[PDB]
């Protein structure tokens, strides 16, 4: 820390702060020269050759060590100059770490570390473990033993294998028992690791060229965070490793990250460790301190120094944060411990440092390094204490340029890795065997199910004084700030003179676990091609080959010029074809555009709330479609969901949650009323444990894969930009030889381009990916955990209601409100807040937009997507469709069901995901289309359409002559039904043979409500209905319809696990109305080329008629619209009356024949088997324009274009649908009628236009198109 005096290697040895140290090693050891950069921190610029006897050889091994990176140089750090530079650098980084709030705290705990005084000399005595000091040679040839705390030596054989090294004890775990021991950090500030980014692009649009460098400060900070854990004897056993599955062509051959490694990194990595294992360690170390206090509390004397036993007892007092009374006895304050621990453990972590140093760095310990570099930090022009490489001013500070080894090329010297490229690998063969050498450190992670401990099954007794939950403070920069203020920076252990030790202190390193070499080669003969194969087929041989030509098909990896793409053929074409230099730059522009073009394709799929943004070429870039129902990725993903992306499917074991036992209290109100609260509280806490648990499983099994792909794609895109830089190149590589011609093709600028083109591409691919992650979590992992909680919740309620009962008379004036409190709480879940377990601004931001759409909420949502009737909410397991089930050809999401026992659709919901307390509070909605009842059979005959019962298992939708019903019924067969009844004796009905939006709400504690088209039609209490069954499957089929020609049309069926409120209902309702598409009088999309009868909503008793064809003729509303009937059944005004209307395309045609909100069209009037053209003369007299049916060829420049409408300019629905316009583009007006001497001719008046803005009064322009429909038995006269 800080380091007071600036050293030089040659500066004269002086017995203190600069001496000839004799580290505690084995056997003899010529003394070595080390400096004292600070109280308790020495620096030896030698290669660690002393610490380990079996490590004096600094030469590389004929066999390679299984690590992604390695580097050797027998000669490094030999000269006396190299030492000085090493001295100058190790320092500058301590100053770097020290210049940060987080840094500052850590170096104060490290210097304060001080290995406990074990040396167990007689219980009651204190003493120094000689292995924690060093002998210091004084000038007069003498030597005085000195206590040490942390030492930095040079690397051993493998220069970049930095790590913590401590000497062990004959019978003590000085690193895992609380004692702590002097640490020797093998580190070098002359080499670094290069890594690659594929996320920061979101915040940095012009992110660096390629591989970035790792600020040496972080690496050193990472290693100290380790000395910290060990100094406080809190290091996790290195026998604790996150097990990894290896047998599989996609799995990593070998790799064993330690918990103490996932701990030290922090970020999410540290979240891979389950809660149960987390608290396992805490108590473990919390008891190591308790013994430290005991050990101290009974220490009478102290052999060794001339320092007061009190002084000593105090150092360790101030170290472990012990508390002592007036007698001087020590104790471990639990609450004060949890803090110290929380600091050494979660505040001081690599991720947290990457915040203080504002540098770019790996975002996970599982992001394997791909390089080594020779850097030189000493010169200020290169690296500064405050800015590092990203120097102030210098063009390095805009986008971590200083860290980009390509941009800041001058500061990084690419060295030779010593692990080839295929040292550790896997052999993957297709089905010409067709195999590939896939790199080990290039395959999937894949955690073993073992790692995830749990313990969620243990039940629990709930007394009155149980201890309630505790937050999950995500360690925000604010919390660190707090720790900083309350941080104690004054006073640092004194250099307590100890009595000389052996001239040669006997060492022997702590024993690390053995390196189990892993198998290599391992062959894999597969069926389908792999994402690895496809990726492979996009690299192509360096360059001395023949001008390669891009070419689809995986066989694109059989020719020496093996290259493949996922781009449109035309690109292949433009690239694969000679281009005369006369015309070359054009080509460049072309490709670039086309590249940045093909590379940015994004599907909106708005009609799919869940995964919005979509990058289609992913499927054919990594062969992700996983081969399903043949191609069409964007359709593939929609049919399955983000599952189609996982190289492997993770499971979720959420045991049958235990239960709370309730300790009862005899005639003790307080103590009782307090137990129920503890019960409910622990239950709330109970839900948190489950959620937090699946987020750990989701963080390592799922989210990790998606991230590998995230890299894979970024890899792909570059493989493409690299070839289109090869091809284009080969061309100009055979240039005309004419200088001054073109400001150079600038390969180092076409690239500056292709860079951006890809950087943005990743911004899209990333959003898309983030959605498949969050989304996969919400519909494939949470539902499971919830089921068990909801169960637990359903149980606890009884156990609680009973408790209250069994204790009434003691809960005298409260046996109701407590009965209400327990019934009111345990009647709704505990929302899943992702922010409670994740800081990631990326994913939370995602999670937020996902939550906004109430549809992603539904436990069942089935639309007709792509080419299937699927359950987008991923709850259904098998949706069996009948044979007599028909799907409207236009909007196939409109299902029609007949009376035939062969037309039916049955849906079964995954059992594991279904809890029986599921239909207490829940809603259901769908769109209905009921034909008209013509016969009398229909009378008093109630057929059922939707049924969900398991022997009296409530709710099933039924129909009966002019009314819709919803009946709830419990096992105790008690039933309750709510009904909406619609009369069939009306001129014009709002429900007959039309579409009706229906929503049914259910609140166990209240009533059952029925909403028709948004408004509440009726409600009936249900606070008396007993328990209800949860049917595993729902059946769509009519049942008991005596009518032979009865049928219905359903649409947008959904099922919600909560009581939708008025607002939600109305929102949901406006959303499923497709306001951008005009409608049939019955609700279907209006259509081009399809004769409709006009019904004027203002004067429903008349009907359009063409007085006389021609401009000298007119159209008007004719006399009395006839009636229709069938005594004792219906009496509706007739519809199929008057002249028909035909809408003709005019703007954007050939496409679907659906008429959309703002289409310009043509209205052909069909007069006497012939079709004419409704037009007018915009040069008439008044505001009104009479309109006539002209001869299509005689119309000419007369006003005829009509702008169809559906949403008022303001945005409100209006019936006024036809706005006529003059060719100049003007606005002649909406079409309506108008009295002209008691004749009311159809007219286009600019009046309505004005009114439609103000009010919303049904006007003379309120038209309605009526096609003939099998639902309206009426016969077109
Ligand atoms: Zn480490």
mmCIF file of N, CA, C and O in Angstrom, residues 52-112:
data_model
loop_
_atom_site.group_PDB
_atom_site.id
_atom_site.type_symbol
_atom_site.label_atom_id
_atom_site.label_comp_id
_atom_site.label_asym_id
_atom_site.label_seq_id
_atom_site.Cartn_x
_atom_site.Cartn_y
_atom_site.Cartn_z
ATOM 1 N N UNK A 52 9.264 -24.053 -3.941
ATOM 2 C CA UNK A 52 9.049 -25.459 -4.262
ATOM 3 C C UNK A 52 10.324 -26.125 -4.748
ATOM 4 O O UNK A 52 10.984 -25.629 -5.654
ATOM 5 N N UNK A 53 10.693 -27.259 -4.144
ATOM 6 C CA UNK A 53 11.905 -27.969 -4.556
ATOM 7 C C UNK A 53 11.738 -28.561 -5.960
ATOM 8 O O UNK A 53 12.646 -28.503 -6.787
ATOM 9 N N UNK A 54 10.564 -29.124 -6.220
ATOM 10 C CA UNK A 54 10.258 -29.710 -7.515
ATOM 11 C C UNK A 54 9.875 -28.642 -8.537
ATOM 12 O O UNK A 54 9.100 -28.913 -9.451
ATOM 13 N N UNK A 55 10.404 -27.432 -8.388
ATOM 14 C CA UNK A 55 10.083 -26.353 -9.320
ATOM 15 C C UNK A 55 11.272 -25.428 -9.620
ATOM 16 O O UNK A 55 11.099 -24.252 -9.954
ATOM 17 N N UNK A 56 12.482 -25.962 -9.506
ATOM 18 C CA UNK A 56 13.658 -25.159 -9.777
ATOM 19 C C UNK A 56 13.965 -25.078 -11.261
ATOM 20 O O UNK A 56 14.772 -24.249 -11.686
ATOM 21 N N UNK A 57 13.324 -25.941 -12.047
ATOM 22 C CA UNK A 57 13.524 -25.980 -13.493
ATOM 23 C C UNK A 57 12.529 -25.056 -14.177
ATOM 24 O O UNK A 57 11.324 -25.317 -14.168
ATOM 25 N N UNK A 58 13.037 -23.983 -14.777
ATOM 26 C CA UNK A 58 12.178 -23.020 -15.448
ATOM 27 C C UNK A 58 12.000 -23.279 -16.945
ATOM 28 O O UNK A 58 11.644 -22.376 -17.701
ATOM 29 N N UNK A 59 12.241 -24.510 -17.377
ATOM 30 C CA UNK A 59 12.089 -24.838 -18.783
ATOM 31 C C UNK A 59 10.737 -25.467 -19.036
ATOM 32 O O UNK A 59 10.169 -26.094 -18.148
ATOM 33 N N UNK A 60 10.196 -25.297 -20.251
ATOM 34 C CA UNK A 60 8.885 -25.874 -20.583
ATOM 35 C C UNK A 60 8.980 -27.371 -20.712
ATOM 36 O O UNK A 60 9.988 -27.899 -21.149
ATOM 37 N N UNK A 61 7.919 -28.078 -20.336
ATOM 38 C CA UNK A 61 7.826 -29.539 -20.381
ATOM 39 C C UNK A 61 7.520 -30.114 -21.761
ATOM 40 O O UNK A 61 6.690 -29.583 -22.500
ATOM 41 N N UNK A 62 8.172 -31.222 -22.123
ATOM 42 C CA UNK A 62 7.908 -31.815 -23.438
ATOM 43 C C UNK A 62 6.411 -32.066 -23.668
ATOM 44 O O UNK A 62 5.954 -32.124 -24.814
ATOM 45 N N UNK A 63 5.666 -32.224 -22.573
ATOM 46 C CA UNK A 63 4.217 -32.428 -22.621
ATOM 47 C C UNK A 63 3.562 -31.141 -22.128
ATOM 48 O O UNK A 63 4.019 -30.551 -21.149
ATOM 49 N N UNK A 64 2.485 -30.713 -22.783
ATOM 50 C CA UNK A 64 1.822 -29.471 -22.393
ATOM 51 C C UNK A 64 0.814 -29.616 -21.264
ATOM 52 O O UNK A 64 0.084 -30.607 -21.212
ATOM 53 N N UNK A 65 0.777 -28.626 -20.363
ATOM 54 C CA UNK A 65 -0.176 -28.640 -19.250
ATOM 55 C C UNK A 65 -1.511 -28.195 -19.809
ATOM 56 O O UNK A 65 -1.570 -27.249 -20.601
ATOM 57 N N UNK A 66 -2.569 -28.898 -19.405
ATOM 58 C CA UNK A 66 -3.924 -28.647 -19.886
ATOM 59 C C UNK A 66 -4.550 -27.345 -19.396
ATOM 60 O O UNK A 66 -5.388 -27.324 -18.500
ATOM 61 N N UNK A 67 -4.130 -26.257 -20.025
ATOM 62 C CA UNK A 67 -4.580 -24.920 -19.694
ATOM 63 C C UNK A 67 -4.723 -24.173 -21.009
ATOM 64 O O UNK A 67 -3.933 -24.373 -21.928
ATOM 65 N N UNK A 68 -5.729 -23.297 -21.122
ATOM 66 C CA UNK A 68 -5.879 -22.570 -22.381
ATOM 67 C C UNK A 68 -4.666 -21.727 -22.744
ATOM 68 O O UNK A 68 -4.317 -21.627 -23.914
ATOM 69 N N UNK A 69 -4.015 -21.128 -21.755
ATOM 70 C CA UNK A 69 -2.841 -20.309 -22.040
ATOM 71 C C UNK A 69 -1.654 -20.657 -21.163
ATOM 72 O O UNK A 69 -1.813 -21.141 -20.043
ATOM 73 N N UNK A 70 -0.459 -20.420 -21.689
ATOM 74 C CA UNK A 70 0.771 -20.674 -20.953
ATOM 75 C C UNK A 70 1.902 -20.003 -21.687
ATOM 76 O O UNK A 70 1.797 -19.712 -22.872
ATOM 77 N N UNK A 71 2.984 -19.742 -20.979
ATOM 78 C CA UNK A 71 4.101 -19.089 -21.607
ATOM 79 C C UNK A 71 5.370 -19.319 -20.814
ATOM 80 O O UNK A 71 5.364 -19.246 -19.580
ATOM 81 N N UNK A 72 6.461 -19.586 -21.526
ATOM 82 C CA UNK A 72 7.737 -19.828 -20.878
ATOM 83 C C UNK A 72 8.856 -18.988 -21.472
ATOM 84 O O UNK A 72 8.778 -18.540 -22.609
ATOM 85 N N UNK A 73 9.897 -18.771 -20.681
ATOM 86 C CA UNK A 73 11.047 -18.009 -21.120
ATOM 87 C C UNK A 73 12.125 -18.114 -20.064
ATOM 88 O O UNK A 73 12.406 -17.151 -19.368
ATOM 89 N N UNK A 74 12.725 -19.295 -19.952
ATOM 90 C CA UNK A 74 13.782 -19.565 -18.991
ATOM 91 C C UNK A 74 14.562 -18.334 -18.549
ATOM 92 O O UNK A 74 14.878 -18.190 -17.369
ATOM 93 N N UNK A 75 14.860 -17.441 -19.488
ATOM 94 C CA UNK A 75 15.625 -16.233 -19.185
ATOM 95 C C UNK A 75 14.925 -15.027 -18.538
ATOM 96 O O UNK A 75 15.599 -14.127 -18.034
ATOM 97 N N UNK A 76 13.595 -14.988 -18.558
ATOM 98 C CA UNK A 76 12.871 -13.856 -17.985
ATOM 99 C C UNK A 76 13.246 -13.562 -16.537
ATOM 100 O O UNK A 76 13.297 -14.466 -15.707
ATOM 101 N N UNK A 77 13.503 -12.286 -16.251
ATOM 102 C CA UNK A 77 13.870 -11.812 -14.912
ATOM 103 C C UNK A 77 15.253 -12.251 -14.424
ATOM 104 O O UNK A 77 15.480 -12.372 -13.225
ATOM 105 N N UNK A 78 16.176 -12.488 -15.349
ATOM 106 C CA UNK A 78 17.524 -12.908 -14.988
ATOM 107 C C UNK A 78 18.427 -11.704 -14.750
ATOM 108 O O UNK A 78 19.026 -11.584 -13.684
ATOM 109 N N UNK A 79 18.524 -10.811 -15.734
ATOM 110 C CA UNK A 79 19.352 -9.611 -15.589
ATOM 111 C C UNK A 79 18.957 -8.767 -14.373
ATOM 112 O O UNK A 79 17.833 -8.851 -13.876
ATOM 113 N N UNK A 80 19.899 -7.952 -13.907
ATOM 114 C CA UNK A 80 19.690 -7.080 -12.758
ATOM 115 C C UNK A 80 18.759 -5.939 -13.095
ATOM 116 O O UNK A 80 18.185 -5.314 -12.211
ATOM 117 N N UNK A 81 18.621 -5.668 -14.385
ATOM 118 C CA UNK A 81 17.763 -4.596 -14.863
ATOM 119 C C UNK A 81 16.309 -5.029 -14.809
ATOM 120 O O UNK A 81 15.441 -4.275 -14.383
ATOM 121 N N UNK A 82 16.057 -6.254 -15.251
ATOM 122 C CA UNK A 82 14.717 -6.822 -15.246
ATOM 123 C C UNK A 82 14.113 -6.778 -13.854
ATOM 124 O O UNK A 82 12.914 -6.575 -13.696
ATOM 125 N N UNK A 83 14.954 -7.007 -12.851
ATOM 126 C CA UNK A 83 14.528 -6.990 -11.463
ATOM 127 C C UNK A 83 13.995 -5.600 -11.175
ATOM 128 O O UNK A 83 12.855 -5.439 -10.757
ATOM 129 N N UNK A 84 14.830 -4.592 -11.410
ATOM 130 C CA UNK A 84 14.445 -3.210 -11.171
ATOM 131 C C UNK A 84 13.126 -2.871 -11.858
ATOM 132 O O UNK A 84 12.260 -2.254 -11.257
ATOM 133 N N UNK A 85 12.961 -3.271 -13.113
ATOM 134 C CA UNK A 85 11.708 -2.997 -13.818
ATOM 135 C C UNK A 85 10.557 -3.756 -13.167
ATOM 136 O O UNK A 85 9.415 -3.312 -13.186
ATOM 137 N N UNK A 86 10.863 -4.916 -12.606
ATOM 138 C CA UNK A 86 9.852 -5.718 -11.954
ATOM 139 C C UNK A 86 9.508 -5.020 -10.674
ATOM 140 O O UNK A 86 8.362 -5.018 -10.244
ATOM 141 N N UNK A 87 10.521 -4.442 -10.047
ATOM 142 C CA UNK A 87 10.317 -3.743 -8.806
ATOM 143 C C UNK A 87 9.482 -2.515 -9.102
ATOM 144 O O UNK A 87 8.501 -2.256 -8.419
ATOM 145 N N UNK A 88 9.852 -1.774 -10.137
ATOM 146 C CA UNK A 88 9.104 -0.582 -10.514
ATOM 147 C C UNK A 88 7.638 -0.867 -10.856
ATOM 148 O O UNK A 88 6.773 -0.053 -10.576
ATOM 149 N N UNK A 89 7.367 -2.021 -11.455
ATOM 150 C CA UNK A 89 6.005 -2.370 -11.814
ATOM 151 C C UNK A 89 5.131 -2.917 -10.692
ATOM 152 O O UNK A 89 4.000 -2.466 -10.519
ATOM 153 N N UNK A 90 5.614 -3.901 -9.940
ATOM 154 C CA UNK A 90 4.824 -4.456 -8.846
ATOM 155 C C UNK A 90 4.335 -3.333 -7.940
ATOM 156 O O UNK A 90 3.242 -3.398 -7.368
ATOM 157 N N UNK A 91 5.162 -2.304 -7.809
ATOM 158 C CA UNK A 91 4.837 -1.150 -6.988
ATOM 159 C C UNK A 91 3.700 -0.329 -7.571
ATOM 160 O O UNK A 91 2.664 -0.155 -6.935
ATOM 161 N N UNK A 92 3.921 0.176 -8.781
ATOM 162 C CA UNK A 92 2.962 0.993 -9.525
ATOM 163 C C UNK A 92 1.556 0.411 -9.544
ATOM 164 O O UNK A 92 0.582 1.128 -9.712
ATOM 165 N N UNK A 93 1.447 -0.894 -9.365
ATOM 166 C CA UNK A 93 0.139 -1.519 -9.355
ATOM 167 C C UNK A 93 -0.444 -1.530 -7.946
ATOM 168 O O UNK A 93 -1.663 -1.629 -7.772
ATOM 169 N N UNK A 94 0.427 -1.461 -6.944
ATOM 170 C CA UNK A 94 -0.031 -1.403 -5.562
ATOM 171 C C UNK A 94 -0.587 0.009 -5.402
ATOM 172 O O UNK A 94 -1.594 0.226 -4.729
ATOM 173 N N UNK A 95 0.079 0.964 -6.044
ATOM 174 C CA UNK A 95 -0.340 2.356 -6.017
ATOM 175 C C UNK A 95 -1.653 2.474 -6.778
ATOM 176 O O UNK A 95 -2.497 3.304 -6.471
ATOM 177 N N UNK A 96 -1.820 1.643 -7.789
ATOM 178 C CA UNK A 96 -3.039 1.680 -8.568
ATOM 179 C C UNK A 96 -4.166 1.161 -7.696
ATOM 180 O O UNK A 96 -5.193 1.811 -7.550
ATOM 181 N N UNK A 97 -3.966 -0.015 -7.112
ATOM 182 C CA UNK A 97 -4.988 -0.619 -6.268
ATOM 183 C C UNK A 97 -5.277 0.308 -5.105
ATOM 184 O O UNK A 97 -6.431 0.523 -4.736
ATOM 185 N N UNK A 98 -4.213 0.876 -4.552
ATOM 186 C CA UNK A 98 -4.326 1.764 -3.405
ATOM 187 C C UNK A 98 -5.057 3.069 -3.673
ATOM 188 O O UNK A 98 -5.572 3.682 -2.759
ATOM 189 N N UNK A 99 -5.102 3.501 -4.921
ATOM 190 C CA UNK A 99 -5.768 4.746 -5.246
ATOM 191 C C UNK A 99 -7.260 4.554 -5.454
ATOM 192 O O UNK A 99 -7.894 5.363 -6.112
ATOM 193 N N UNK A 100 -7.827 3.487 -4.911
ATOM 194 C CA UNK A 100 -9.257 3.240 -5.083
ATOM 195 C C UNK A 100 -9.873 2.917 -3.726
ATOM 196 O O UNK A 100 -9.288 2.176 -2.939
ATOM 197 N N UNK A 101 -11.050 3.472 -3.453
ATOM 198 C CA UNK A 101 -11.712 3.237 -2.176
ATOM 199 C C UNK A 101 -11.718 1.787 -1.818
ATOM 200 O O UNK A 101 -11.355 1.428 -0.705
ATOM 201 N N UNK A 102 -12.133 0.953 -2.763
ATOM 202 C CA UNK A 102 -12.151 -0.486 -2.536
ATOM 203 C C UNK A 102 -10.709 -0.968 -2.314
ATOM 204 O O UNK A 102 -10.416 -1.732 -1.393
ATOM 205 N N UNK A 103 -9.809 -0.499 -3.168
ATOM 206 C CA UNK A 103 -8.428 -0.879 -3.029
ATOM 207 C C UNK A 103 -7.943 -0.549 -1.639
ATOM 208 O O UNK A 103 -7.488 -1.430 -0.914
ATOM 209 N N UNK A 104 -8.061 0.720 -1.264
ATOM 210 C CA UNK A 104 -7.615 1.219 0.042
ATOM 211 C C UNK A 104 -8.026 0.370 1.245
ATOM 212 O O UNK A 104 -7.210 0.111 2.132
ATOM 213 N N UNK A 105 -9.281 -0.066 1.279
ATOM 214 C CA UNK A 105 -9.756 -0.897 2.376
ATOM 215 C C UNK A 105 -9.005 -2.233 2.411
ATOM 216 O O UNK A 105 -8.408 -2.578 3.424
ATOM 217 N N UNK A 106 -9.020 -2.963 1.290
ATOM 218 C CA UNK A 106 -8.362 -4.273 1.158
ATOM 219 C C UNK A 106 -6.907 -4.338 1.597
ATOM 220 O O UNK A 106 -6.520 -5.290 2.268
ATOM 221 N N UNK A 107 -6.098 -3.353 1.209
ATOM 222 C CA UNK A 107 -4.685 -3.352 1.594
ATOM 223 C C UNK A 107 -4.495 -3.119 3.098
ATOM 224 O O UNK A 107 -3.433 -3.424 3.655
ATOM 225 N N UNK A 108 -5.534 -2.590 3.748
ATOM 226 C CA UNK A 108 -5.516 -2.322 5.186
ATOM 227 C C UNK A 108 -5.915 -3.570 5.969
ATOM 228 O O UNK A 108 -5.568 -3.715 7.133
ATOM 229 N N UNK A 109 -6.663 -4.459 5.331
ATOM 230 C CA UNK A 109 -7.062 -5.709 5.957
ATOM 231 C C UNK A 109 -5.904 -6.693 5.745
ATOM 232 O O UNK A 109 -5.600 -7.517 6.606
ATOM 233 N N UNK A 110 -5.256 -6.600 4.589
ATOM 234 C CA UNK A 110 -4.134 -7.473 4.282
ATOM 235 C C UNK A 110 -2.960 -7.213 5.200
ATOM 236 O O UNK A 110 -2.342 -8.150 5.688
ATOM 237 N N UNK A 111 -2.658 -5.946 5.452
ATOM 238 C CA UNK A 111 -1.533 -5.602 6.325
ATOM 239 C C UNK A 111 -1.895 -5.916 7.786
ATOM 240 O O UNK A 111 -1.046 -6.238 8.625
ATOM 241 N N UNK A 112 -3.188 -5.866 8.049
ATOM 242 C CA UNK A 112 -3.749 -6.131 9.356
ATOM 243 C C UNK A 112 -3.982 -7.626 9.564
ATOM 244 O O UNK A 112 -4.251 -8.063 10.677
#
